[PDB]
Amino acid sequence: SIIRPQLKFREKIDNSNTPFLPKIFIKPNAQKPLPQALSKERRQDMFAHPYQYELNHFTPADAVLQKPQPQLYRPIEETPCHFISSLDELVELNEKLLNCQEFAVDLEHHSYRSFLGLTCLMQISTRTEDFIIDTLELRSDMYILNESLTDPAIVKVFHGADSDIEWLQKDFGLYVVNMFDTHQAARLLNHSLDHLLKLYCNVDSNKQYQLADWRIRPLPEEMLSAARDDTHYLLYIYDKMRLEMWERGNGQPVQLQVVWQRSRDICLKKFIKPIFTDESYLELYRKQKKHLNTQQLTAFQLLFAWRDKTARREDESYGYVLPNHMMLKIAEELPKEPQGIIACCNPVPPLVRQQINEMHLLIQQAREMPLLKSEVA
Numbered sequence: 001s002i003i004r005p006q007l008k009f010r011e012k013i014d015n016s017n018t019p020f021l022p023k024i025f026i027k028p029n030a031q032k033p034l035p036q037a038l039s040k041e042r043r044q045d046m047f048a049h050p051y052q053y054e055l056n057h058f059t060p061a062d063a064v065l066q067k068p069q070p071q072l073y074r075p076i077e078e079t080p081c082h083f084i085s086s087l088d089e090l091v092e093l094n095e096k097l098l099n100c101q102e103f104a105v106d107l108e109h110h111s112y113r114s115f116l117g118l119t120c121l122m123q124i125s126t127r128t129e130d131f132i133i134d135t136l137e138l139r140s141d142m143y144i145l146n147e148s149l150t151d152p153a154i155v156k157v158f159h160g161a162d163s164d165i166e167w168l169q170k171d172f173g174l175y176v177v178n179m180f181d182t183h184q185a186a187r188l189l190n191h192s193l194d195h196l197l198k199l200y201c202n203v204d205s206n207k208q209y210q211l212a213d214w215r216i217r218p219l220p221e222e223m224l225s226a227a228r229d230d231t232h233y234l235l236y237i238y239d240k241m242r243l244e245m246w247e248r249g250n251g252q253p254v255q256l257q258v259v260w261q262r263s264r265d266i267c268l269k270k271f272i273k274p275i276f277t278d279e280s281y282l283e284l285y286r287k288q289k290k291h292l293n294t295q296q297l298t299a300f301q302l303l304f305a306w307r308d309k310t311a312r313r314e315d316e317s318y319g320y321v322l323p324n325h326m327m328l329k330i331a332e333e334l335p336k337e338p339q340g341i342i343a344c345c346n347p348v349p350p351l352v353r354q355q356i357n358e359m360h361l362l363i364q365q366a367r368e369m370p371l372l373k374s375e376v377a
Protein backbone atom coordinates (compact mmCIF):
# COMPACT_ATOMS: atom_id res chain seq x y z
CA SER A 1 0.00 0.00 0.00
CA ILE A 2 1.21 3.48 -1.02
CA ILE A 3 2.85 5.28 1.91
CA ARG A 4 0.37 7.99 2.93
CA PRO A 5 1.71 11.24 1.31
CA GLN A 6 0.29 13.38 4.13
CA LEU A 7 3.34 12.47 6.21
CA LYS A 8 5.63 14.63 4.03
CA PHE A 9 3.39 17.67 4.43
CA ARG A 10 5.07 20.69 6.02
CA GLU A 11 1.68 21.68 7.48
CA LYS A 12 -0.66 19.08 9.01
CA ILE A 13 -4.30 18.92 7.92
CA ASP A 14 -6.86 20.38 10.29
CA ASN A 15 -9.50 17.69 10.70
CA SER A 16 -11.52 19.40 13.41
CA ASN A 17 -15.06 20.74 13.52
CA THR A 18 -13.24 24.07 13.55
CA PRO A 19 -14.66 26.25 10.76
CA PHE A 20 -12.64 26.09 7.54
CA LEU A 21 -10.56 29.24 7.13
CA PRO A 22 -9.41 30.26 3.63
CA LYS A 23 -5.70 29.59 3.09
CA ILE A 24 -4.81 32.43 0.72
CA PHE A 25 -2.49 34.96 2.41
CA ILE A 26 -1.74 37.30 -0.52
CA LYS A 27 -4.39 38.35 -3.05
CA PRO A 28 -3.13 38.90 -6.64
CA ASN A 29 -5.54 40.57 -9.10
CA ALA A 30 -7.22 41.97 -5.95
CA GLN A 31 -9.86 44.58 -6.79
CA LYS A 32 -10.89 44.61 -3.13
CA PRO A 33 -8.25 44.12 -0.40
CA LEU A 34 -7.90 40.88 1.54
CA PRO A 35 -8.33 40.99 5.37
CA GLN A 36 -5.13 41.43 7.36
CA ALA A 37 -6.24 38.51 9.50
CA LEU A 38 -5.38 36.34 6.49
CA SER A 39 -1.93 37.98 6.28
CA LYS A 40 1.04 35.62 6.47
CA GLU A 41 2.25 37.85 9.31
CA ARG A 42 -0.95 37.93 11.39
CA ARG A 43 -0.88 34.11 11.51
CA GLN A 44 -13.72 42.42 7.01
CA ASP A 45 -14.75 38.76 7.30
CA MET A 46 -11.79 36.37 7.11
CA PHE A 47 -14.31 33.55 6.78
CA ALA A 48 -15.62 35.09 3.54
CA HIS A 49 -14.86 34.17 -0.08
CA PRO A 50 -11.57 36.05 -0.80
CA TYR A 51 -12.50 36.97 -4.39
CA GLN A 52 -16.21 37.51 -3.66
CA TYR A 53 -16.11 41.10 -4.88
CA GLU A 54 -14.09 40.60 -8.06
CA LEU A 55 -16.24 37.66 -9.21
CA ASN A 56 -19.40 39.67 -8.52
CA HIS A 57 -17.87 42.46 -10.60
CA PHE A 58 -16.46 40.53 -13.57
CA THR A 59 -17.49 40.50 -17.23
CA PRO A 60 -16.10 38.62 -20.27
CA ALA A 61 -14.11 40.85 -22.62
CA ASP A 62 -15.81 41.59 -25.93
CA ALA A 63 -12.90 39.89 -27.70
CA VAL A 64 -14.03 36.44 -26.50
CA LEU A 65 -17.73 37.22 -27.08
CA GLN A 66 -17.12 37.71 -30.80
CA LYS A 67 -17.44 35.00 -33.44
CA PRO A 68 -14.47 32.79 -32.57
CA GLN A 69 -12.19 31.13 -35.13
CA PRO A 70 -11.56 27.70 -33.57
CA GLN A 71 -7.95 26.56 -33.29
CA LEU A 72 -7.68 22.79 -33.69
CA TYR A 73 -6.02 20.96 -30.84
CA ARG A 74 -2.34 20.22 -31.42
CA PRO A 75 -1.63 16.56 -32.24
CA ILE A 76 -0.95 14.61 -29.06
CA GLU A 77 2.05 13.17 -30.97
CA GLU A 78 3.55 16.62 -31.44
CA THR A 79 2.46 18.21 -28.17
CA PRO A 80 5.14 18.50 -25.47
CA CYS A 81 4.39 17.18 -21.99
CA HIS A 82 5.96 18.85 -18.94
CA PHE A 83 6.05 17.41 -15.42
CA ILE A 84 6.21 20.02 -12.65
CA SER A 85 7.28 19.11 -9.12
CA SER A 86 9.54 21.93 -7.98
CA LEU A 87 8.92 25.55 -7.06
CA ASP A 88 11.06 26.84 -9.97
CA GLU A 89 9.03 24.71 -12.37
CA LEU A 90 5.79 26.07 -10.90
CA VAL A 91 6.95 29.70 -10.96
CA GLU A 92 8.18 29.38 -14.56
CA LEU A 93 4.84 27.96 -15.72
CA ASN A 94 2.88 30.72 -14.00
CA GLU A 95 4.85 33.29 -16.00
CA LYS A 96 4.05 31.38 -19.17
CA LEU A 97 0.32 31.32 -18.24
CA LEU A 98 0.30 35.03 -17.44
CA ASN A 99 1.16 35.54 -21.12
CA CYS A 100 -1.70 33.30 -22.29
CA GLN A 101 -5.01 34.21 -23.92
CA GLU A 102 -6.75 31.23 -22.27
CA PHE A 103 -5.84 27.79 -20.83
CA ALA A 104 -7.32 24.43 -19.78
CA VAL A 105 -7.55 23.22 -16.17
CA ASP A 106 -8.51 19.93 -14.45
CA LEU A 107 -7.53 18.04 -11.29
CA GLU A 108 -7.02 14.55 -9.96
CA HIS A 109 -8.48 13.79 -6.56
CA HIS A 110 -8.35 11.06 -3.92
CA SER A 111 -10.75 10.44 -1.05
CA TYR A 112 -10.43 6.88 0.25
CA ARG A 113 -7.29 7.44 2.38
CA SER A 114 -8.18 10.99 3.47
CA PHE A 115 -10.81 12.49 5.71
CA LEU A 116 -11.60 15.62 3.68
CA GLY A 117 -10.24 14.44 0.35
CA LEU A 118 -6.94 15.41 -1.21
CA THR A 119 -5.82 16.93 -4.52
CA CYS A 120 -3.03 14.80 -5.96
CA LEU A 121 -2.61 16.31 -9.38
CA MET A 122 -3.40 19.37 -11.47
CA GLN A 123 -3.43 19.64 -15.23
CA ILE A 124 -3.16 22.70 -17.43
CA SER A 125 -2.94 23.04 -21.20
CA THR A 126 -1.98 26.02 -23.34
CA ARG A 127 -2.67 26.18 -27.06
CA THR A 128 0.63 24.33 -27.62
CA GLU A 129 1.79 22.50 -24.47
CA ASP A 130 0.46 20.10 -21.85
CA PHE A 131 1.47 20.48 -18.20
CA ILE A 132 1.09 18.12 -15.25
CA ILE A 133 1.66 19.36 -11.69
CA ASP A 134 2.43 17.24 -8.63
CA THR A 135 0.12 18.94 -6.14
CA LEU A 136 1.28 16.59 -3.37
CA GLU A 137 4.91 17.57 -3.79
CA LEU A 138 4.10 21.24 -4.53
CA ARG A 139 1.23 21.46 -2.00
CA SER A 140 2.42 24.41 0.11
CA ASP A 141 3.62 26.22 -3.06
CA MET A 142 0.51 25.90 -5.26
CA TYR A 143 -0.97 29.21 -4.10
CA ILE A 144 1.43 30.94 -6.51
CA LEU A 145 -0.91 29.97 -9.35
CA ASN A 146 -3.49 32.49 -8.05
CA GLU A 147 -1.70 35.16 -10.05
CA SER A 148 -2.86 33.53 -13.30
CA LEU A 149 -6.07 31.85 -12.12
CA THR A 150 -7.49 35.02 -10.59
CA ASP A 151 -6.59 37.19 -13.57
CA PRO A 152 -9.88 38.34 -15.24
CA ALA A 153 -7.79 38.95 -18.35
CA ILE A 154 -7.16 35.28 -19.02
CA VAL A 155 -9.96 32.75 -19.55
CA LYS A 156 -9.80 29.39 -17.74
CA VAL A 157 -11.61 26.54 -19.54
CA PHE A 158 -13.05 23.80 -17.28
CA HIS A 159 -15.43 20.82 -17.65
CA GLY A 160 -17.69 20.48 -14.64
CA ALA A 161 -15.62 22.53 -12.19
CA ASP A 162 -18.04 22.36 -9.26
CA SER A 163 -15.86 20.05 -7.15
CA ASP A 164 -12.58 21.45 -8.49
CA ILE A 165 -13.37 24.97 -7.28
CA GLU A 166 -13.96 23.57 -3.82
CA TRP A 167 -10.75 21.53 -3.77
CA LEU A 168 -8.53 24.34 -5.12
CA GLN A 169 -9.25 26.36 -2.00
CA LYS A 170 -9.43 23.62 0.63
CA ASP A 171 -6.02 22.23 -0.34
CA PHE A 172 -4.08 25.20 -1.68
CA GLY A 173 -6.15 28.35 -1.21
CA LEU A 174 -6.53 28.85 -4.97
CA TYR A 175 -9.41 30.79 -6.52
CA VAL A 176 -10.56 31.21 -10.12
CA VAL A 177 -11.62 34.47 -11.79
CA ASN A 178 -12.91 34.31 -15.40
CA MET A 179 -13.88 30.72 -16.12
CA PHE A 180 -15.78 29.08 -18.99
CA ASP A 181 -17.24 25.74 -17.84
CA THR A 182 -17.78 23.48 -20.89
CA HIS A 183 -20.30 21.44 -18.92
CA GLN A 184 -22.38 24.64 -18.56
CA ALA A 185 -22.14 25.18 -22.32
CA ALA A 186 -23.30 21.58 -22.95
CA ARG A 187 -26.41 22.21 -20.85
CA LEU A 188 -27.59 25.02 -23.13
CA LEU A 189 -26.62 23.36 -26.41
CA ASN A 190 -27.94 20.04 -24.99
CA HIS A 191 -23.06 13.00 -21.39
CA SER A 192 -20.74 15.98 -21.70
CA LEU A 193 -16.96 15.44 -22.06
CA ASP A 194 -17.43 11.78 -23.09
CA HIS A 195 -19.55 13.21 -25.88
CA LEU A 196 -17.67 16.53 -26.14
CA LEU A 197 -14.54 14.56 -26.95
CA LYS A 198 -16.32 12.28 -29.43
CA LEU A 199 -18.65 14.92 -30.91
CA TYR A 200 -16.04 17.64 -31.42
CA CYS A 201 -12.81 15.74 -31.92
CA ASN A 202 -14.00 12.23 -32.71
CA VAL A 203 -11.86 10.79 -29.88
CA ASP A 204 -12.88 8.18 -27.25
CA SER A 205 -10.66 8.74 -24.16
CA ASN A 206 -10.93 5.36 -22.47
CA LYS A 207 -9.59 5.86 -18.94
CA GLN A 208 -11.57 9.11 -18.59
CA TYR A 209 -14.29 7.91 -16.22
CA GLN A 210 -11.85 5.65 -14.44
CA LEU A 211 -11.19 5.76 -10.68
CA ALA A 212 -7.52 5.45 -9.81
CA ASP A 213 -5.30 6.20 -6.83
CA TRP A 214 -3.57 9.40 -7.91
CA ARG A 215 -1.33 9.33 -4.83
CA ILE A 216 0.83 6.79 -6.67
CA ARG A 217 4.36 7.85 -7.52
CA PRO A 218 5.74 7.50 -10.08
CA LEU A 219 2.67 8.09 -12.20
CA PRO A 220 2.73 5.53 -15.00
CA GLU A 221 2.51 6.76 -18.60
CA GLU A 222 -1.09 5.48 -18.74
CA MET A 223 -2.32 7.80 -15.99
CA LEU A 224 -0.09 10.59 -17.20
CA SER A 225 -1.83 10.18 -20.54
CA ALA A 226 -5.33 9.98 -19.06
CA ALA A 227 -4.50 13.08 -17.02
CA ARG A 228 -3.39 15.22 -19.96
CA ASP A 229 -6.39 14.05 -22.02
CA ASP A 230 -8.63 15.96 -19.60
CA THR A 231 -7.21 19.32 -20.74
CA HIS A 232 -5.53 18.78 -24.14
CA TYR A 233 -8.76 19.30 -26.10
CA LEU A 234 -10.64 21.83 -23.92
CA LEU A 235 -9.46 25.00 -25.68
CA TYR A 236 -10.57 23.66 -29.07
CA ILE A 237 -13.91 22.54 -27.60
CA TYR A 238 -13.97 25.93 -25.90
CA ASP A 239 -13.78 27.58 -29.33
CA LYS A 240 -16.07 25.12 -31.12
CA MET A 241 -18.73 25.64 -28.43
CA ARG A 242 -18.76 29.43 -28.50
CA LEU A 243 -19.05 28.98 -32.27
CA GLU A 244 -22.04 26.63 -32.39
CA MET A 245 -23.47 28.94 -29.72
CA TRP A 246 -22.84 32.24 -31.49
CA GLU A 247 -24.36 30.60 -34.55
CA ARG A 248 -27.55 30.43 -32.48
CA GLY A 249 -27.85 33.90 -31.00
CA ASN A 250 -27.90 35.23 -34.58
CA GLY A 251 -24.47 36.70 -33.91
CA GLN A 252 -25.12 38.13 -30.45
CA PRO A 253 -23.31 37.35 -27.15
CA VAL A 254 -26.53 35.90 -25.70
CA GLN A 255 -25.77 32.32 -24.72
CA LEU A 256 -22.09 33.16 -24.37
CA GLN A 257 -22.50 35.63 -21.49
CA VAL A 258 -24.78 33.07 -19.82
CA VAL A 259 -22.13 30.33 -19.80
CA TRP A 260 -19.74 32.90 -18.32
CA GLN A 261 -22.32 34.08 -15.82
CA ARG A 262 -23.15 30.57 -14.63
CA SER A 263 -19.53 29.46 -14.58
CA ARG A 264 -18.40 32.43 -12.49
CA ASP A 265 -21.09 31.41 -10.00
CA ILE A 266 -19.38 28.04 -9.63
CA CYS A 267 -16.27 30.08 -8.79
CA LEU A 268 -18.20 31.63 -5.92
CA LYS A 269 -18.91 28.27 -4.32
CA LYS A 270 -17.14 28.00 -0.97
CA PHE A 271 -15.75 24.99 0.85
CA ILE A 272 -17.41 23.87 4.08
CA LYS A 273 -16.07 21.27 6.49
CA PRO A 274 -18.52 18.33 6.57
CA ILE A 275 -20.40 17.29 9.71
CA PHE A 276 -21.86 13.88 10.49
CA THR A 277 -24.53 12.85 12.98
CA ASP A 278 -25.57 9.28 13.72
CA GLU A 279 -29.11 10.67 13.65
CA SER A 280 -29.11 10.43 9.84
CA TYR A 281 -28.48 6.67 9.88
CA LEU A 282 -30.72 5.88 12.88
CA GLU A 283 -33.58 7.60 11.05
CA LEU A 284 -32.80 5.56 7.93
CA TYR A 285 -32.76 2.25 9.85
CA ARG A 286 -36.10 3.28 11.32
CA LYS A 287 -37.74 3.74 7.91
CA GLN A 288 -36.46 0.21 7.50
CA LYS A 289 -37.13 -2.70 9.85
CA LYS A 290 -35.37 -1.04 12.80
CA HIS A 291 -35.46 -3.52 15.69
CA LEU A 292 -32.58 -1.70 17.38
CA ASN A 293 -33.02 -1.70 21.14
CA THR A 294 -31.32 0.40 23.82
CA GLN A 295 -28.20 -1.78 23.75
CA GLN A 296 -27.78 -2.08 19.98
CA LEU A 297 -28.64 1.59 19.44
CA THR A 298 -26.06 2.52 22.07
CA ALA A 299 -23.35 0.50 20.33
CA PHE A 300 -24.12 2.31 17.11
CA GLN A 301 -23.68 5.74 18.78
CA LEU A 302 -20.44 4.61 20.38
CA LEU A 303 -19.09 3.09 17.13
CA PHE A 304 -20.19 6.12 15.18
CA ALA A 305 -18.36 8.28 17.68
CA TRP A 306 -15.29 6.09 17.66
CA ARG A 307 -15.12 5.96 13.85
CA ASP A 308 -15.47 9.74 13.45
CA LYS A 309 -12.79 10.20 16.08
CA THR A 310 -10.37 7.74 14.46
CA ALA A 311 -11.02 8.98 10.93
CA ARG A 312 -10.39 12.65 11.77
CA ARG A 313 -7.23 11.82 13.73
CA GLU A 314 -5.73 9.24 11.33
CA ASP A 315 -6.90 11.39 8.38
CA GLU A 316 -8.76 8.53 6.65
CA SER A 317 -12.29 8.35 5.30
CA TYR A 318 -15.17 6.66 7.13
CA GLY A 319 -15.25 3.90 4.56
CA TYR A 320 -11.62 3.02 5.21
CA VAL A 321 -11.93 3.10 9.00
CA LEU A 322 -15.21 1.20 9.24
CA PRO A 323 -18.02 1.29 6.61
CA ASN A 324 -21.72 1.74 7.43
CA HIS A 325 -22.91 -1.80 6.76
CA MET A 326 -20.07 -3.07 8.96
CA MET A 327 -20.65 -0.65 11.86
CA LEU A 328 -24.38 -1.39 11.73
CA LYS A 329 -23.66 -5.12 11.69
CA ILE A 330 -21.67 -4.96 14.93
CA ALA A 331 -24.30 -2.71 16.49
CA GLU A 332 -26.90 -5.45 15.86
CA GLU A 333 -24.78 -8.55 16.60
CA LEU A 334 -23.27 -7.03 19.77
CA PRO A 335 -20.38 -9.52 19.87
CA LYS A 336 -19.39 -10.46 23.41
CA GLU A 337 -15.74 -11.12 22.55
CA PRO A 338 -13.22 -8.94 20.71
CA GLN A 339 -12.86 -11.61 18.00
CA GLY A 340 -16.63 -11.51 17.68
CA ILE A 341 -16.16 -7.98 16.36
CA ILE A 342 -13.41 -8.84 13.85
CA ALA A 343 -15.38 -11.86 12.72
CA CYS A 344 -18.18 -9.55 11.61
CA CYS A 345 -16.30 -7.52 8.99
CA ASN A 346 -15.53 -8.61 5.41
CA PRO A 347 -12.74 -7.85 5.10
CA VAL A 348 -11.40 -6.76 8.50
CA PRO A 349 -10.24 -3.12 8.21
CA PRO A 350 -6.71 -2.45 9.54
CA LEU A 351 -7.81 0.16 12.09
CA VAL A 352 -10.49 -2.16 13.46
CA ARG A 353 -7.74 -4.74 13.91
CA GLN A 354 -5.53 -2.15 15.61
CA GLN A 355 -8.28 -0.71 17.83
CA ILE A 356 -10.02 -4.01 18.51
CA ASN A 357 -9.46 -3.61 22.25
CA GLU A 358 -10.90 -0.08 22.17
CA MET A 359 -13.94 -1.21 20.18
CA HIS A 360 -14.41 -4.24 22.42
CA LEU A 361 -14.78 -1.98 25.47
CA LEU A 362 -17.40 0.15 23.69
CA ILE A 363 -19.52 -2.86 22.77
CA GLN A 364 -19.22 -4.22 26.31
CA GLN A 365 -20.49 -0.90 27.63
CA ALA A 366 -23.48 -1.19 25.30
CA ARG A 367 -24.17 -4.68 26.59
CA GLU A 368 -24.49 -3.39 30.14
CA MET A 369 -27.23 -0.98 29.21
CA PRO A 370 -30.68 -1.61 30.69
CA LEU A 371 -33.14 -3.20 28.25
CA LEU A 372 -36.62 -1.62 28.09
CA LYS A 373 -39.79 -3.47 29.09
CA SER A 374 -40.79 -4.28 25.51
CA GLU A 375 -37.16 -5.04 24.64
CA VAL A 376 -36.94 -7.93 27.11
CA ALA A 377 -36.00 -11.14 25.26
Ligand SMILES: [Y+3]
Nearest residue numbers: 107108227230
Ligand atom coordinates in the same frame (compact mmCIF):
# COMPACT_ATOMS: atom_id res chain seq x y z
Y1 LIG B 1 -9.20 12.51 -14.50
Ligand SMILES: [Y+3]
Nearest residue numbers: 277278279301
Ligand atom coordinates in the same frame (compact mmCIF):
# COMPACT_ATOMS: atom_id res chain seq x y z
Y1 LIG C 1 -26.76 11.21 18.46
